[PDB]
Design an enzyme around this catalytic site. Structure first.
Site, PDB file in Angstrom:
ATOM      1  N   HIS A  72       0.880  -1.206   0.000  1.00 42.58           N
ATOM      2  CA  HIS A  72       0.000   0.000   0.000  1.00 42.58           C
ATOM      3  C   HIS A  72       0.892   1.223   0.000  1.00 42.58           C
ATOM      4  O   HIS A  72       0.183   2.239  -0.222  1.00 42.58           O
ATOM      5  CB  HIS A  72      -1.060  -0.022   1.102  1.00 42.58           C
ATOM      6  CG  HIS A  72      -0.453   0.274   2.462  1.00 42.58           C
ATOM      7  ND1 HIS A  72      -0.105  -0.701   3.405  1.00 42.58           N
ATOM      8  CD2 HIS A  72      -0.189   1.492   3.006  1.00 42.58           C
ATOM      9  CE1 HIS A  72       0.332  -0.087   4.525  1.00 42.58           C
ATOM     10  NE2 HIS A  72       0.302   1.224   4.263  1.00 42.58           N
TER      11      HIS A  72
ATOM     12  N   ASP B  69      -0.044  -7.508   0.900  1.00 45.51           N
ATOM     13  CA  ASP B  69       0.361  -6.060   1.100  1.00 45.51           C
ATOM     14  C   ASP B  69       1.888  -6.084   1.002  1.00 45.51           C
ATOM     15  O   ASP B  69       2.520  -6.106   2.075  1.00 45.51           O
ATOM     16  CB  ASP B  69      -0.159  -5.573   2.451  1.00 45.51           C
ATOM     17  CG  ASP B  69       0.044  -4.047   2.566  1.00 45.51           C
ATOM     18  OD1 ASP B  69      -0.349  -3.462   3.600  1.00 45.51           O
ATOM     19  OD2 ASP B  69       0.621  -3.480   1.606  1.00 45.51           O
TER      20      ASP B  69
ATOM     21  N   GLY C 144       2.608   5.841   9.416  1.00 47.43           N
ATOM     22  CA  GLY C 144       3.973   6.192   8.967  1.00 47.43           C
ATOM     23  C   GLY C 144       4.862   4.928   9.152  1.00 47.43           C
ATOM     24  O   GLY C 144       5.911   4.845   8.460  1.00 47.43           O
TER      25      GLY C 144
ATOM     26  N   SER D  97       4.180   1.972   8.346  1.00 46.62           N
ATOM     27  CA  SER D  97       3.947   0.955   7.293  1.00 46.62           C
ATOM     28  C   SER D  97       5.210   0.619   6.493  1.00 46.62           C
ATOM     29  O   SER D  97       5.926   1.580   6.169  1.00 46.62           O
ATOM     30  CB  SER D  97       2.953   1.355   6.183  1.00 46.62           C
ATOM     31  OG  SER D  97       1.726   1.709   6.900  1.00 46.62           O
TER      32      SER D  97
ATOM     33  N   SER E 236       1.993  -3.783   7.922  1.00 44.47           N
ATOM     34  CA  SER E 236       0.865  -3.545   7.036  1.00 44.47           C
ATOM     35  C   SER E 236      -0.120  -2.573   7.732  1.00 44.47           C
ATOM     36  O   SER E 236      -0.308  -1.502   7.122  1.00 44.47           O
ATOM     37  CB  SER E 236       0.047  -4.809   6.742  1.00 44.47           C
ATOM     38  OG  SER E 236      -1.065  -4.464   5.863  1.00 44.47           O
TER      39      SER E 236
HETATM   40  B1  0EG Z   1       0.991   3.041   7.161  1.00 43.82           B
HETATM   41  O1  0EG Z   1       0.620   3.499   5.785  1.00 43.82           O
HETATM   42  O2  0EG Z   1       2.072   3.930   7.770  1.00 43.82           O
HETATM   43  C1  0EG Z   1      -0.181   2.726   8.135  1.00 43.82           C
HETATM   44  N1  0EG Z   1      -1.007   1.635   7.587  1.00 43.82           N
HETATM   45  C2  0EG Z   1      -2.286   1.785   7.254  1.00 43.82           C
HETATM   46  O3  0EG Z   1      -2.926   2.844   7.428  1.00 43.82           O
HETATM   47  C3  0EG Z   1      -3.041   0.599   6.664  1.00 43.82           C
HETATM   48  C4  0EG Z   1      -3.110   0.672   5.147  1.00 43.82           C
HETATM   49  C5  0EG Z   1      -4.552   0.604   4.776  1.00 43.82           C
HETATM   50  C6  0EG Z   1      -5.371   0.978   6.010  1.00 43.82           C
HETATM   51  N2  0EG Z   1      -4.440   0.620   7.099  1.00 43.82           N
HETATM   52  C7  0EG Z   1      -4.806   0.468   8.363  1.00 43.82           C
HETATM   53  O4  0EG Z   1      -4.051   0.151   9.284  1.00 43.82           O
HETATM   54  C8  0EG Z   1      -6.264   0.476   8.696  1.00 43.82           C
HETATM   55  C9  0EG Z   1      -6.241   1.920   8.967  1.00 43.82           C
HETATM   56  N3  0EG Z   1      -6.371  -0.210   9.970  1.00 43.82           N
HETATM   57  C10 0EG Z   1      -7.378  -1.079  10.110  1.00 43.82           C
HETATM   58  O5  0EG Z   1      -8.146  -1.343   9.204  1.00 43.82           O
HETATM   59  O6  0EG Z   1      -7.345  -1.831  11.397  1.00 43.82           O
HETATM   60  C11 0EG Z   1      -8.173  -3.077  11.488  1.00 43.82           C
HETATM   61  C12 0EG Z   1      -7.925  -3.661  12.885  1.00 43.82           C
HETATM   62  C13 0EG Z   1      -9.621  -2.657  11.344  1.00 43.82           C
HETATM   63  C14 0EG Z   1      -7.669  -4.015  10.398  1.00 43.82           C
HETATM   64  C15 0EG Z   1       0.273   2.452   9.601  1.00 43.82           C
HETATM   65  C16 0EG Z   1       0.975   1.095   9.733  1.00 43.82           C
HETATM   66  C17 0EG Z   1      -0.855   2.537  10.652  1.00 43.82           C
END
Ligand code: 0EG
Length: 198
Positions: A36, A63, A141, A143, A159
């Protein structure tokens, strides 16, 4: 730039992600990160300079991604831990209950344990299956950053998880965190990469 697990990189001068691990694909240098974070051909920059482009990625479903770097980058078998470093020694997968740490540009180096494998995350974009869950905290951040045991066995790349309103899951108890990582093994075989080790 020196490529180390955990450091920040930007994509197309907009989003930020963290480096996962230095790897090679024959003579090409690269790093593995989260799919992503960018689309194929997006430009990666480290400290304002162009270091490479996204060579392939899969997201959602999985991912994962790898960025091919220019020859001038220096790959290192290391992950950041504050001012210190954890040496990458291999990719033996740890089992449920093992302790593991992760490194990324937002919350730094955090450790916890693996609590479950083969978890599905239902992201806005679509499900991502087969993730491993740990309880080390993380924030927006992080990720793409490294997940590694203190012994140096690289486990996967960050992820996502249950970020709270402050942008991380560090203010809630470990028992309530769900921090998910994509397993490294399948990424190395899917793209024919070899991990850089020391
Ligand atoms: B990263 O880009 O720094 C970020 N990851 C991140 O936001 C990922 C990519 C798609 C959405 N997502 C999520 O963590 C979503 C926001 N979280 C989520 O759906 O939590 C569930 C428990 C409902 C799965 C960083 C690692 C936070």
């Amino acid at each position: 730039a020196n490529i180390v697990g955990g450091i920040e990189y930007s994509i197309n001068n907009a989003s930020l992600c963290s480096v996962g691990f230095s790897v090679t694909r024959g003579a090409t240098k690269g790093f593995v990160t989260a799919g992503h974070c960018g689309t194929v051909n997006a430009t990666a920059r480290i400290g304002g300079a162009v270091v490479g482009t996204f060579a392939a990625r899969v997201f959602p479903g999985n991912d994962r991604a790898w960025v091919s770097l220019t020859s001038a980058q220096t790959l290192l078998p290391r992950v950041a831990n504050g001012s210190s470093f954890v040496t990458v020694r291999g990719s033996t997968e740890a089992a449920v209950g093992a302790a593991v740490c992760r490194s990324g540009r937002t919350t730094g180096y955090q450790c916890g344990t693996i609590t479950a494998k083969n978890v599905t995350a239902n992201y806005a974009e679509g499900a991502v299956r087969g993730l491993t869950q740990g309880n080390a905290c993380m924030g927006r951040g992080d990720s793409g950053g490294s997940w590694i045991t203190s012994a140096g066995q690289a486990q996967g790349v960050m992820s996502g998880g249950n970020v709270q309103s402050n942008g991380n899951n560090c203010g809630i108890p470990a028992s309530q965190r769900s921090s998910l990582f994509e397993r490294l093994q399948p990424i190395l075989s899917q793209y024919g990469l070899s991990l850089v080790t020391g």
